[PDB]
Design an enzyme around this catalytic site. Structure first.
Site, PDB file in Angstrom:
ATOM      1  N   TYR A  59       0.826  -1.205   0.000  1.00  0.00           N
ATOM      2  CA  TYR A  59       0.000   0.000   0.000  1.00  0.00           C
ATOM      3  C   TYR A  59       0.868   1.266   0.000  1.00  0.00           C
ATOM      4  CZ  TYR A  59      -4.171  -2.870   0.439  1.00  0.00           C
ATOM      5  OH  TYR A  59      -5.168  -3.781   0.172  1.00  0.00           O
TER       6      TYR A  59
ATOM      7  N   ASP B 161      -3.673 -14.255  -0.976  1.00  0.00           N
ATOM      8  CA  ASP B 161      -3.183 -14.564   0.372  1.00  0.00           C
ATOM      9  C   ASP B 161      -4.348 -14.631   1.376  1.00  0.00           C
ATOM     10  OD1 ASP B 161      -0.460 -14.592  -0.372  1.00  0.00           O
ATOM     11  OD2 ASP B 161      -0.222 -12.442   0.018  1.00  0.00           O
TER      12      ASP B 161
END
Ligand code: FE
Ligand code: FE
Ligand code: FE
Ligand code: FE
Ligand code: HG
Ligand code: HG
Ligand code: HG
Ligand code: HG
Ligand code: HG
Ligand code: HG
Ligand code: HG
EC number: 1.17.4.1
Lengths: 340, 340
Positions: free
Chosen positions: B122, B237
């Protein structure tokens, strides 16, 4: 008083490494200390998987090994395994609750993650050279011989964790718990952390390098190459870990991060010197058990002891402590080709 | 009463998942529950690095976006960053001290580690699209709408962490602390654990998927494609993470692992239901805020709220809770192109 997400907006560039406001947002565009971000980057670039390494010939080599040499090899393996078991969980349980800057918080979690990879690499090796790992792992818990060289490690951690809990629950001051007085001092807790970090530095900078020497000795006579490849990879990571602790300790000592720490460090002086001396002495004593049934051509208690002294002086000098041993040249210069 | 290395020789195959003897040796040749070893292996084979993803055209894409769409994209990105910051540290601090089997201990550390790679990604996206990243990161901690979820999540973790400390320090019973009576009950502690777990399950099973829909809506229009490639890796994930908590909860409620917990989960069943419905309602109220300035192609408060109910029904059933909403089919089947 601990929180997984502090609602107060704070300048993370101004917080101390430890004991400040618990970290809220995880950002990596800036850092108070660029070195921790560099360590995360380096560690991530070194990502490896033990299962991929070919240790298929190691079973043939091991089997052919004489009994006393099996003893030396497997004993070194049991110790490395116990140290990694502790290193896989401890940095997270003891340091995460006290960290106040993002880059350090993430470095600790990356460092600990890499340790679980090392632990996994040992199961990979054990499984490929013994008929039943269960015998190897069960002996780790028992057998005072192992617990003897490692005594005190879990100690430093467990004490730091308990004092930290009291601090989060009661805050600083003198309290009354079930009719008994309990004192909570931040100054004493800071001392407990510094001593713990020093012990961890000794574990990765000294205890582990001694074990590498035993591993590579077999590699020198062209034996146990599967194990050798893995140890080279582990050693490459360990160099990053010890760099991290050296920086943590030296930054705390400088007084630039927290002046109270520089003051406490001057008081911790004799204590941290002694813990390094104690660790060195434990490694030597462990040599007695390693070579109980005999030694090997280029490796014996005497040579190992010289290397312990050689490396301890190097590590202690790196964190500003006086040297306890006579200065000397590398007693096993052949190890240099295996490291770095 | 916690220790980084319990000196008692125990059978790790007979220990409960939680509240048993603290894990000593880290081994991976056997396990009480295979699912956790399977999860560690899958997560490790999925290793990726955000730096490797090209996001060089995302800047121009973002600037060209209408005002209300910037709002949507950035508000979603900030909420994701918030949850990732929490998930990177919390499983470790909250679960490690209570786990009693090695496979679960390492899965949790591997899980937490993967979350820090998500946080790193991010930062990679944010600074490649805004010029002054600090503005974004500061709003995350103070945004009133976003925090309308941060405290609730943080609260479940914090209460469990606090009671765990009292249990470890004082043990069960009625105690006194500074003139106040303080009761410690293992039964109540068990209930607290069952609650973080249900809460975290809702977080990864529902909260994050709602945000994925928003990110991929932009990718369906050939915009913010660098962001899209990263969210795709993240979502891959997350499927593993939710599989992990689903197994933990079902093992605890079936009575197979700990009779007492099963008795407890049955008594606080209505509370668990309200907790899950409360999470769905917050995501619905959020979609409202997200589209307060207008909608975009492929998404609006109505289609989004329909996805919330669809996904919530599925997840609740997976952990034994009655369905709160009316059954229906997937409102946005195009999202499967980016998921599984
Ligand atoms: Fe290691
Ligand atoms: Fe290490
Ligand atoms: Fe994540
Ligand atoms: Fe996750
Ligand atoms: Hg430590
Ligand atoms: Hg320590
Ligand atoms: Hg050695
Ligand atoms: Hg939780
Ligand atoms: Hg959304
Ligand atoms: Hg959405
Ligand atoms: Hg419940």
């Amino acid at each position: 008083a601990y929180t997984t997400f502090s609602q107060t907006k704070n300048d993370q560039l101004k917080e101390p490494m430890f004991f400040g406001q618990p970290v809220n947002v995880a950002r990596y565009d800036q850092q108070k200390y660029d070195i921790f971000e560099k360590l995360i980057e380096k560690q991530l670039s070194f990502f490896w998987r033990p299962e991929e390494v070919d240790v298929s010939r190691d079973r043939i080599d091991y089997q052919a090994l004489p009994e006393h040499e099996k003893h030396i090899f497997i004993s070194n393996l049991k110790y490395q395994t116990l140290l990694e078991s502790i290193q896989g969980r401890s940095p997270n349980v003891a340091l995460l609750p006290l960290i106040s800057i993002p880059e350090l918080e993430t470095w600790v979690e990356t460092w600990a993650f890499s340790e679980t990879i090392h632990s996994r690499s040992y199961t990979h090796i054990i499984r490929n050279i013994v008929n039943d790992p269960s015998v190897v792992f069960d002996d780790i818990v028992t057998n005072e011989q192992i617990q003897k060289r490692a005594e005190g490690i879990s100690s430093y951690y467990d004490e730091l964790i308990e004092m930290t809990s009291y601090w989060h629950l009661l805050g600083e001051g003198t309290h009354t718990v079930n009719g008994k007085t309990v004192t909570v001092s931040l100054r004493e807790l800071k001392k407990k952390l510094y001593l713990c970090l020093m012990s961890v530095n000794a574990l990765e900078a000294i205890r582990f390098y001694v074990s590498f020497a035993c591993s590579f000795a077999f590699a020198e006579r062209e034996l146990m190459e599967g194990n050798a490849k893995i140890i080279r990879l582990i050693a490459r990571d360990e160099a990053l870990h010890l760099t991290g602790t050296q920086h943590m300790l030296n930054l705390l000592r400088s007084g630039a991060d927290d002046p109270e720490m520089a003051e406490i460090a001057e008081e911790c002086k004799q204590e941290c010197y002694d813990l390094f001396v104690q660790a060195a002495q434990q490694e030597k004593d462990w040599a007695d058990y390693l070579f109980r049934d005999g030694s090997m051509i280029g490796l014996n208690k005497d040579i190992l002891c010289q290397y312990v002294e050689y490396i301890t002086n190097i590590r202690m000098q790196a964190v500003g402590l006086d040297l306890p041993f006579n200065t000397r040249s590398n007693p096993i210069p052949w190890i240099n080709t295996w490291l770095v």
